[PDB]
Symmetry: C3
Subunit: 263 residues, 3 copies
C-alpha cells in the first residue's frame, strides 16, 4: 500500500500482460480527449485499470477506464483512457498513480494532456497549447514526506521544441490548476490573468509534480475547449467541453502521435 | 445521506410543519445579522434546525439555530438564523445544506448575507454592499462529482438592479471568501486588493456555488463591519463585528424586507 | 486531548523536569538551523519531545526531536530542535503544539525561524531576514472554533527594532507560507512577487497565528538558503538548503543569542 509499492506492482502486471519490459513514454488523456485514442495508433494490449494495483480508490464503485499499450514510432506508449481528478474527493495518490505506475514501467516522458479555458487574447477554441509552466492553486501536493522536488523547467523546454517541430503553430502558455469542479467566476479569471496564467483547468498540476518527483520529463498539452468565464460572455458547460474535445479529437490524436514519434 | 436526499427530506418537513408547499425565497443571515430578524417580519413558524434532516454535523454537540418561515410581500421566505462556516471543521455539505434544503422547499432566490472587512477606499462601517462577484480563495468546493457549474453572473445582475431600486445608495463590490477563522494580515489585505477584491470575509462563496449548482439565483449582501486589516489601523475583533451587526440590524432587516418584497 | 489541555500538561512536565516555573522566550528552529543550537548557549535540561504530551502525532512512528531549556541572558528559553510541518500530513495541532506548550510554560515571545527562498533583488544566500509580515497561502488555519484572532502587527515591530539593535544589517521582508513539500515553479515565484512576497517557505504561518491566538509576541527570522525558483536559474535542493543552514549556523546561533539577551 505505499504508493511506490503499488506502482512497482502495476508495472509488473503491465510488463507481464503486454510482453513489453519498458514503455518509455506515457500519455494521460484530458477531459474530452478520449475520442483521440483511435488516432494515436492501434493498441496491442488493453488493460482495465481495475485489474491494475493502486489505480482504483478503495471505495466508490464505478467503472474506471483502460490502460492501452500502443506502438508509436520507436516507442511503446502507455495510454491512460479515464482518470481521476482531485474534485472526485479521493486521495491524490489516485490522481497521480497512473504517472507513478507508468514511470515504474519505464516511462521517461509523460505527455500530460487536458481541457482548459483560454485566458489570453490570442487563444481560440480547438487550439492546442503547450504548457510552458504552471500555477498550482490547489493548496495541495501529491508528495507527502520531506520529499522536496525542484520544479524549475517542470515542462521540459526541449520537449517543447520537439513538439513545435511537429506543429510550428503551437503557442505555449502558463496553466493554472484549480481544484474545481465548479468553473471560475469572471472576477476569478481577472485574478488569474493578474497572476500570470494563460490557461485554466482542474487537473494536471499534481501529475506534473509527481512526474518530476519520480524523475520523468513532462510535455504538457492543453486543448482550449472554451474561453475562460467573463472573457467573451459565452456560458461554460461540460457538454460544450466534451463537444470541443470530440471536434478536435482527430487533430489532437494525430498531433500527439507525430510528436511522440519525434521523441 | 446523499446531501440531495437529506435536502428533499428537510423540504418535506418544512412543507409539513409550515403548511406552505413552496417557499420561493430564502435568507441566510451573516455573522452579527441575527438581531435583523425582528425587522424582517413576524415568523409564522419557527423550526429548530436540529429537528430538520441534514442540518447538524453528526458529531460536536451544540445548540444549532432556527429556520423561520416569514411572509414578506407576496413571498413565503425561509430565514436561516444560525449557520455553520467552513472554519468550524465540518464537511462543506453542512455549510451549504440550508441552501440545498431551501431550494428543495421551492426557493428560487437565495439572499446570502455576511459580515465583511471593507478593502476599498469608499467603504464605511455599517454600510451594506451588494456582491457583484466573488473570489473563492478557500481551495475548496461544496460540489463533489463531475458536477460542473458555470459561475458567470453567479450574483444575478437583475436582483442587483432590484435591490438598488429599494436603496439607490447601494454600492457593489467583489467579495473574497477566505477559510478563516483568523483575520488577515495587512500584507494579505494588500494582496487581496491586487487580486481585485473590495470586501473580505469567511463565508458565502460555498453557499453561492451550491445555490447556482441547484438552479437558484443569488443576491449577495455584505455588511461592512470593519475596515480590513492595515487600512486604518483599527484592531479587528469579533465583538466589534457583532457590535456593528447589532447597530445596523434595524437598517439591514428593513432593507432586506423591502428588497425581498420587490422580487 | 483538547490541544490546550495537552499544552497545559506539557508545561507541567517542563516545569517539573527543568525546575523552571516560567520559560519567558521560546525558539522554534527552522529547516537546516539545527547546528545553530550549540551557538545559542548550553542547555541545562534536554527533553525528548516524545516524553511530552501532545507533541507526537498518534501514528507514523519516527524519532521526534528534543526540547531544550537554555539560559540566554536573563531568560530561560525553550528551544525546539525538530518540528513537524504541514507537508508531513498531520493535523495542524501538531505543527503548532510546540508554540502552545511554550506559551503554557510561560513564553511571552516566540522566535520563529525558518529556511526561505529569496524573492527580492537585494537578497543573498546566507542572509538572515526579519519577517515584517506574512502571506498565508495554505488555505488553512491552526485555529478551529469561532476563534477570531487579529493579525495586525503579527510580527511585533518592537521586537524588530530590538533585533536590528543587535545587527543593523538586518533587512526585513514579507514571508509567503506555502504547503510544500514540492518547491515552486518559476511562474509561481513571479506570482508571489506580484502578491508582495519577499521570501518563500513551507512553515511558520501557522506557528505565528497560533502564537498570536495564545497571546505571545512573535519575532520571525528567515535564513535565505537559496534564491527562489527562476530568479537565478540555480537548482533548488534540500541538501543545498541544509548546507546553507549549516554554513550559517554559527552566525544564526550567535545572532539569536544576542537578540534574545536584548529582550
Ligand atoms: O474554463 C475552465 N475552467 C476550469 N476547468 C476547465 N476545464 C475546461 N475548461 C475549463
Ligand atoms: O475583516 C474581515 N476579514 C475576514 N472575515 C471578516 N468578517 C468580518 N470582518 C472580516
Ligand atoms: O525556495 C523555497 N521554497 C519553498 N520552501 C523553501 N525552503 C527553503 N527554500 C525554499
Amino acid at each position: 500500500p505505499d504508493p511506490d509499492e503499488l506502482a512497482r506492482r502495476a508495472a509488473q502486471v503491465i510488463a507481464d500482460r503486454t510482453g513489453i519490459g519498458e514503455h518509455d513514454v506515457a500519455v494521460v488523456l484530458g477531459s474530452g480527449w478520449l475520442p483521440a485514442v483511435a488516432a494515436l495508433g492501434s493498441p496491442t494490449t488493453v488493460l482495465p485499470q481495475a485489474e491494475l494495483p493502486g489505480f482504483v480508490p478503495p471505495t466508490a464503485a464505478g467503472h474506471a477506464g483502460e490502460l492501452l499499450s500502443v506502438p508509436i514510432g520507436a516507442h511503446r506508449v502507455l495510454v491512460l483512457a479515464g482518470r481521476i481528478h482531485a474534485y472526485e474527493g479521493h486521495d491524490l495518490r489516485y490522481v497521480v498513480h497512473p504517472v507513478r505506475a507508468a514511470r515504474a514501467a519505464g516511462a521517461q516522458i509523460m505527455v500530460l494532456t487536458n481541457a482548459a479555458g483560454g485566458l489570453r487574447a490570442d487563444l481560440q477554441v480547438g487550439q492546442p497549447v503547450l504548457i510552458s509552466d504552471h500555477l498550482n492553486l490547489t493548496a495541495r501536493s501529491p508528495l507527502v514526506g520531506g520529499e522536496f522536488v525542484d520544479l524549475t523547467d517542470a515542462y521540459s523546454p526541449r520537449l517543447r521544441e520537439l513538439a513545435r517541430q511537429s506543429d510550428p503553430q503551437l503557442a505555449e502558455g502558463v496553466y493554472a490548476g484549480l481544484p474545481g469542479p465548479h468553473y471560475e467566476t469572471p472576477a476569478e479569471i481577472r485574478m488569474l490573468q493578474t497572476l500570470g496564467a494563460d490557461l485554466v483547468g482542474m487537473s494536471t498540476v499534481h501529475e506534473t509534480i509527481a512526474a518530476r518527483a519520480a524523475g520523468a520529463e513532462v510535455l504538457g498539452v492543453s486543448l482550449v475547449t472554451n474561453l475562460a468565464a467573463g472573457i467573451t460572455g459565452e456560458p461554460l458547460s461540460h457538454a460544450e467541453v466534451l463537444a470541443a474535445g470530440a471536434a478536435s479529437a482527430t487533430r489532437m490524436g494525430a498531433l500527439l502521435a507525430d510528436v511522440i514519434a519525434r521523441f
